[PDB]
């Protein structure tokens, strides 16, 4: 019962067709006459036997997130490596060719005219460079979005046009005049570490080359490779930690040596942000600062309490001091790209905040966790402490009465009344002061919990982001009208989404520092109740001290008695 | 600086004006030529120197709050025998003459045609007789709130017919037809108890006498009053206390003897209810059981768990089976009147359900404190007994010790050796158990507390007779339209006021019974808390019998020692 469901594509034969089991729901797609095309085929049948969707979302207009093009290439790069290893020049590297799967909750990346390179556009004879050109100018097509070099230009002219350009400059802005800045370096609106970008620029640098001969790197062969495939093994090897300070707004990838401690990054963090190390608070995403022993990261500073804390295109700048810039249509989905781009990077900031604020939450639940602990030993230790002194009071009075028979027969030593005095005077000298504190401040804690939390307006903002998106994909369903209306909608999203930043903004930066105030308190209170602590053990081992040392005299003086 | 404010009325020279200081605030009014009226007006001043307001709202058209007007009944009645004391017959007993003062949050009453009586409308001499009249008729106007004897109908005829009836008849309801059921009995409708109505319903034949020499009571001269007047203060004696029973929905009054005691009583209520005495519980406004020893009350059943649990008027029953019944103004007003009274009912019915709510939840309340505070006193007595097996352990073996070494005197008997084995024994057999069933039961009493109410649904029924009533008050906007239109909406009204009831009824008849069985686990809760604790103590007793018996033999065979 495999039932025919909407096909998949288009195939050579005929139409990619999807297609499930009914009772198993197994989604199956089926590939659909010259026996040279069939032969090859059957050619299909025996070498495969032996995206564009999301890059089309509005969303993504920018480009992608880069940890998730990054496992792109490694996915895609696994499997060029593969096909070329096999004598496979796929030829048709596009993100058409590439139907997710979401195991495990991972897109893995599989295979089945922007990317016709010049070798293969040209000439019929062609080299592994086809697909290193047109997998590199795929892979700037997810990072930007659009067409590395000349993007909206005729393929014909496309071609020869980079074919006599400088072959280092990897991306070629065409201004409005028709002069282009062939530029060897990536477009600045992205959500890239320059760390990864300047070894991607070298790598692109190698997939931009626009002779095919010299396309690619050279072979080199103890790791059995172009440099191409070794400089993404070096961005797989790239092992940084992003850590945001909390009281910069501020994040910093740190590159990570496969050997250094967390304290000679502590010493890193002290170097490349000025907060002091002893007072460099590190919570997770659990809040939880690693024992530094060891090898997104909350800074925080422990010592301070208050925490005080752009568009860079100029043109949406002007559009939020002139909204009646007359921009055409390619303009105006540029700059509201660069908009969407910039208020959905404010979403993912105040979105971490939020979480910043959670691991200080959660960080100290788990401090008053421990104090209640403490506590309530405290608790114990101290009921059976005074009735430690309570039955030993009890037994000094009636061996003071017994002793007193005994002076009655005059046999011992007066420093017995004068031990047992001194002896009930350390009884007397041993609380809930501290209790109170704990209890109280327990309460400023519950109201910590009660005090009202402003993400509510980021999902306003949210929802505004959502609305500039909506106009821009009224910019993608008629980019054909060639308007040059103003975006005023477009700055009033952008003032509230300032406004509404900056209230929720103070708003958990004055709840921040009450958490850090009481934080501090709690600290405050440890060591006294540990110390405490300590001094109530004590005495209940003086005690038993003072126990054992009256029974002492208690047993040898009988045997005194008990000698003649 | 007296400023003239809006005038309080018209005086008999001109209009009673009121002003005010502007620097004190002080409302004080100001009365404004024959020289026999002027002469009389300085006889009012000699004389003095010597609420139809509320009766016009439409909220209460049938009529007041019974012991409001019983209030009144006191403030004017003392008013209008400390005049007849004076010598003064005042004429003129109408709720225009009734200016209240809100002292202390209490209206006090005070003096400054429906009401001529007929040896004042027909006669030039009188009698106090008038006042007698115009007194009761006052207070049956504040009763029903209208006319006792032929509402609306020409004071000539009015006068000469009841002038010519019954005079023990204390109710004219002139019908549709034109024929009137002279009666002696009040209308139904009411807010009355009939053990207050009956005496009031005499003192009533005795003021609406026709007869002016026989109008009032024959003068009682040991209390110096008529009968009316003795009457009225057996209405100041009658003292009675209001039960509902919540099993029932059923409040009863309970006439109070100045002698009887709670639990005779209780004797009451167990035959007037059929519920036992023991599991009577009376809850208070506070939900307070009273001391039984002592002389609105809450009554639950204390055995029972699920608690189980209409329009008089028939006309407007008639409307909720079709509204379009054709009344005229008189008997829309009438029966529009008599459905306010209804659902003003409703409300006060359920608005006390959740006043006997909420003593059942803060005795609950009062219950849990109690618990906690036996249940930290069974921690502390259960830290420092554990204590006492811990160093009364110690000092038997330290004891068995030294006594092991007298054995090598070989100086005691072996009981000795299982005596103290058998009090070590002792120290074995002795939690938190309980304690947990604390907790956990703590636990479903903030849930309690969690537990949504459906007050907001009687705010809703409230908007509703809001609603009913400003229908109503189209009504008395305009009496003189004489529609015929239906009243579906006041149907709507209602029938939702029926659902809401029974919604908001379940709603807490289940929250109302797991109090019960929360409350009732309470009490179970209680007397094992209470037999362990003095288990507790008198295991520490015993701790000191064998410690101080120990220590006994210790000093005794000592001083056996010190013998010879």
Redesign the interface.
């Known amino acids: 019962p495999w039932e025919m469901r909407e096909r998949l594509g288009t195939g050579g034969f005929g139409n990619v067709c999807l297609y499930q089991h009914r009772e198993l729901d197994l989604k199956i797609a089926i590939k659909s006459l010259s026996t040279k095309n069939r032969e090859r085929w059957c050619h299909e049948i025996q070498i495969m036997k032996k995206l564009r969707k999301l890059l089309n979302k509005p969303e993504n207009c920018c480009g992608l997130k880069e940890s998730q093009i990054l496992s792109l290439l490694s996915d895609i790069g696994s499997g060029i490596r593969y096909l070329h290893e096999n004598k496979i020049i796929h030829r048709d590297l596009k993100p058409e060719n590439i139907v997710l799967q979401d195991v495990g909750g991972k897109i893995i990346h599989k295979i089945i005219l922007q990317y016709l390179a010049p070798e293969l556009f040209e000439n019929k004879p062609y080299t592994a460079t086809v697909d290193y050109w047109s997998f590199g100018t795929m892979v700037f097509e997810c990072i930007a979005g659009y067409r590395p070099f000349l993007h909206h230009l005729q393929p014909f002219t496309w071609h020869e046009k980079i074919k006599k350009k400088d072959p280092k400059c990897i991306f070629a802005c065409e201004e409005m005049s028709g002069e282009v800045r062939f530029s060897s370096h990536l477009p600045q609106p992205n959500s890239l570490c320059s760390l990864i970008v300047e070894p991607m620029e070298n790598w692109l640098q190698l997939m931009l080359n626009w002779d095919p001969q010299q396309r690619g790197g050279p072979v080199d062969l103890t790791l059995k490779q172009p440099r191409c495939f070794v400089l993404m093994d070096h961005i797989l090897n790239l092992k940084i930690v992003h850590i945001l300070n909390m009281t910069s707004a501020k994040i910093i990838s740190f590159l990570l040596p496969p050997d250094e401690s967390l304290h000679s990054l502590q010493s890193r963090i002290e170097r490349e942000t000025g907060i002091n190390t002893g007072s460099q608070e590190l919570l997770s995403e659990t809040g939880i600062s690693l024992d530094p022993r060891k090898p997104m990261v909350y800074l925080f500073d422990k010592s301070k309490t208050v925490y005080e804390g752009r568009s860079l295109s100029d043109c949406v700048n002007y559009i939020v001091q002139d909204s009646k810039i007359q921009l055409p249509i390619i303009q105006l989905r540029k700059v509201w790209a660069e908009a969407v781009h910039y208020v959905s990077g404010l979403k993912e900031d105040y979105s971490r905040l939020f979480q910043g604020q959670r691991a200080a939450m959660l960080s100290l639940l788990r401090y008053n966790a421990n104090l209640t602990k403490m506590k309530n030993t405290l608790?114990?230790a101290s009921?059976?402490l005074?009735?430690?002194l309570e039955?030993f009071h009890k037994?000094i009075q009636?061996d003071l009465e017994?002793y007193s028979?005994?002076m009655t027969?005059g046999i011992s030593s007066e420093k017995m009344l004068k031990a047992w005095k001194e002896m009930e005077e350390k009884a007397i000298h041993y609380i809930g002061y501290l209790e109170d504190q704990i209890m109280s401040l327990h309460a400023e804690i519950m109201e910590l919990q009660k005090s009202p939390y402003g993400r509510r307006q980021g999902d306003l903002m949210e929802s505004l982001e959502q609305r500039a998106i909506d106009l821009y994909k009224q910019l993608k369903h008629r980019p054909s009208d060639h308007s040059y209306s103003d975006s005023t909608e477009m700055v009033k999203i952008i003032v509230h989404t300032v406004q509404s930043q900056d209230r929720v903004l103070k708003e958990l930066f004055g709840h921040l520092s009450k958490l850090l105030g009481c934080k501090q308190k709690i600290i405050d209170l440890l060591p006294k109740v540990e110390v405490a602590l300590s001094n109530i053990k004590e005495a209940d081992n003086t005690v038993?001290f003072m126990?054992?040392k009256r029974?002492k005299e208690?047993?040898h003086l009988?045997?005194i008695?008990?000698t003649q």
Chains 1, 2 share one sequence.
């Open positions: 608790i114990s009921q059976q005074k009735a430690k039955f037994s009636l017994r028979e005994q027969y038993m126990q054992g029974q208690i047993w009988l045997k008695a008990c």
